[PDB]
Design an enzyme around this catalytic site. Sequence first.
Site, PDB file in Angstrom:
ATOM      1  CB  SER A   6       2.422   3.215  -7.866  1.00  0.00           C
ATOM      2  OG  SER A   6       2.476   1.891  -8.366  1.00  0.00           O
ATOM      3  CD  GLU A   7       3.833  -2.393  -3.937  1.00  0.00           C
ATOM      4  OE1 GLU A   7       3.242  -1.764  -3.025  1.00  0.00           O
ATOM      5  OE2 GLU A   7       3.792  -3.651  -4.058  1.00  0.00           O
ATOM      6  CG  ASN A   8       4.518  -0.114 -10.266  1.00  0.00           C
ATOM      7  OD1 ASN A   8       3.828   0.384  -9.398  1.00  0.00           O
ATOM      8  ND2 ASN A   8       4.223  -0.017 -11.542  1.00  0.00           N
TER       9      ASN A   8
END
Lengths: 465, 470
Positions: A291-293
């Site tokens: 996940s990019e976060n």
Amino acid sequence: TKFYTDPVEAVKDIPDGATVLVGGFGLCGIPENLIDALLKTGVKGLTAVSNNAGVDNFGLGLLLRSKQIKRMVSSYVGENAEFERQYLSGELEVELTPQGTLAERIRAGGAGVPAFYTPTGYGTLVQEGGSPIKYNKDGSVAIASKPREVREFNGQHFILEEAITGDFALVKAWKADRAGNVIFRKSARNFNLPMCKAAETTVVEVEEIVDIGAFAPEDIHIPQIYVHRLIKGEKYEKRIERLSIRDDVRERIIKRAALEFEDGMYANLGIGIPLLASNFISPNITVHLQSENGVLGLGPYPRQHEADADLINAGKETVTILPGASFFSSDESFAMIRGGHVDLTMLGAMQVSKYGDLANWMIPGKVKGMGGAMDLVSSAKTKVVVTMEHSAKGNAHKIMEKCTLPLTGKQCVNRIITEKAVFDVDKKKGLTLIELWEGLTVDDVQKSTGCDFAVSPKLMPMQQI
Amino acid sequence: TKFYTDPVEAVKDIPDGATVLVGGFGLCGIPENLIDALLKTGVKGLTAVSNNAGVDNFGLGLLLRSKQIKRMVSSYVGENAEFERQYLSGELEVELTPQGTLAERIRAGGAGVPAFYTPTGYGTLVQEGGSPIKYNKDGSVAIASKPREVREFNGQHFILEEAITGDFALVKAWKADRAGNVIFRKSARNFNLPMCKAAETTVVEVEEIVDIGAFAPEDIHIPQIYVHRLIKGEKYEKRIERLSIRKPGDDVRERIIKRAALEFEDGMYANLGIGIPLLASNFISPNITVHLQSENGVLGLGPYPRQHEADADLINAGKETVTILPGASFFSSDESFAMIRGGHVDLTMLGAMQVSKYGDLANWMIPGKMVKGMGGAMDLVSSAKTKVVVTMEHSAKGNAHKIMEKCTLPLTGKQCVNRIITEKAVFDVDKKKGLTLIELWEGLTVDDVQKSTGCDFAVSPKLMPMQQIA
């Protein structure tokens, strides 16, 4: 590290027009006490460097409704109708920048590196410039985005991005020790960690202060050298944005998408079809979802009691993590992505071209920003798979010679799975149709596709998990 | 992550000619079992990207001894006599690269960034070219480094550096879980961490493999996505190069140190260089707290250790065994230099062979005598936001000037020294004005300083006798 008991005293000296770096991803890791002190000081003119625009009633959405910001520098500004209102009216200046470019620029600014090359945004409007930063009351454009310099290294094309520093950073963390060392909880770290490094004065609010010696020296996330002002916030709403608790052609694409996953694979999945495809992953294999976060090892949606505002996906949904998971900052997350360490990025698309251009982030005259979408398609080392319904309304094409909507990426798609066909896609050779839905012919495919394509000589019918 | 019981199997496919990234700082966090496996395979022609050259009988030094390295990319190559024989004789090619630039290029390599600008090396042989890569039999240079691209941003000049990636990375870590997540111990993190991200195939050796769930998800230093091949090493010598345990020409040196100690202020972040600067830390008032930073990845250095506290995984930039205070942190070499390069350290205190009228510094090369690398010195003087104080004996042997109009030795930095403390004088240094003699060792006059200094200088109207910390 100066400790303050008044959140207003922590931020009294922010002069109008300051650049302020604001931590947070969605509503996850928002410095809600410091942002409240700013409503209370009423400081104005601000250029807010913040990944997102919060929501109307919360986060940076609060300084927006109270007119305290001149310019937002962000990557994704959706789910705030009042920010749309101020932008189109010519009250707000807006610089949209890819999320991973945003993270690296802030990091660069903290690390003394005035500029760096990224493949992200090449062949898109980020490179081209010219997009409205500010309108006049006319609808004419008062400010346009500057072009980026393009340069080539080892075959690929890259663009030059410049560092971001701020005058102040408003940072939320989990705990500080009494020396000023700081740790972050779960996915709430995101942009808070690099933003600590990139401002002349960082103000951090924490949930709790502990003794010197409470943190293992190897496990300090932000060393004290970066923390100038520290408060323990008085109140924390911590407001989950999307409390996410555990047709014929769409299931078809999904049951085919699901066959793309292999054992040992690191994958990043867009919202919708790609994410739903993960439900069909055999338990006899392991896929690792990124996940990019800043999460590796995402699990299923949480039960009521398992929902945590500090753990969300890029969709902004409450998620869980499996054992073996790790958390990391937004700059580290995009280093993993931009660096090619992810095996498979599965994405939706509005249009895909013959040689693999992808349009998926903007419709002219309909204004949310690109997020991490440009970063996720920018590495040659990562297989990019688009999952999309084959045609739009009126059988209007979506696979074509040239996209007509703004590009997310240039020659980045490796394969397209629709309800009618699977194509391999090459930069220089174009499309090969490798699979066709049973009953349909190649001419049923040709008539709903907007370009030529090769047919595989091992052309099987379309697989289904 | 694939797990191996045979370390020869995990490195068996490294081809001749490979570029290999080798972790460790000094002898700290060296992948000793993986280096031994390359000795067994005998793979040659390597380009080794490695911060230092080990010592003669340890670390990269072993692969130098077996002639398996053709080229090195390092910041500091001293304390290895076989290295120096191979380099000076023309057998080894050596790219001397500033430590923070090496760190950031490697990280760029892992981060998908092909090139970036840095201020480190501007005004030096790094930027202008001419650094010796390879010698001729007769001791002339066969290969010298090339000029770098120079570019201005915001009124400062920077040089363009390219990413470093490897074919392979040989990485020492402390523990790995059974998913292949990895953690590092103390200052043994250093280059191991970024090198883990920057190679096509990363091979990590660890001392213990633990269960999935033994690491808090917030405290995984290397997530499993970066670990391709994992071994638990059979044997760890964990040699200490310098056992420095808590307790000639010290007469004038105690003078410099007692004056230099007065440069510290409460709450200051300082980085102290090897040589004299280390010694003034002992004179830091106990009424204040100075926070001491080490380029190998430490903040909050304490005193030298008692015997029982000495640890091979904890050293300073002089490769000495050290301790940490409560509130200390550890971090990788790329993050260390981001701290330094980004201007977050308040004070840097350094030795010098020469300092010029306008603040140029020469402290890393004596052509034809001493070519060991700049280490982190060029980075330490790269930031306009950091005070740079030089501590040195005023004159060289034979009363040869060390403070002069222009340096004759290769520069470490151009116009970067703010203050010069000697045993005779304290000068303030302005990049447009020149020198001002602000303090003078009582009993000396101004003509004593002028006859020992190779240029002119202003004399402060508030000139005072040179201060000494009581």
